[PDB]
Amino acid sequence: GASGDLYEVERIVDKRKNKKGKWEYLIRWKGYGSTEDTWEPEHHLLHCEEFIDEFNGLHMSKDK
């Protein structure tokens, strides 16, 4: 199952910039969800870009 770092993602919460100006996506993992909201790097968050698209949908974001 969960081999290490990438626990069972419920969904993407949100995204932000790092103090070094890097893309971190606030991801929640199931079981804690709301109080889980943890900042995972873009290039390690998920093997599926569908989750990133889900963020753009749930935040109601006109981006093209």
Curated annotation (Swiss-Prot):
Location in the cell: Nucleus
Tissue: Ubiquitously expressed.
All residue ranges annotated as the Chromo domain in the record: 7-64
Subunit annotation: Interacts (via chromo domain) with histone H3K9me3.
Protein name, UniProt field: Chromodomain Y-like protein 2
Organism: Homo sapiens (Human)
Residues of the whole record sequence present: 2 to 64 of 506
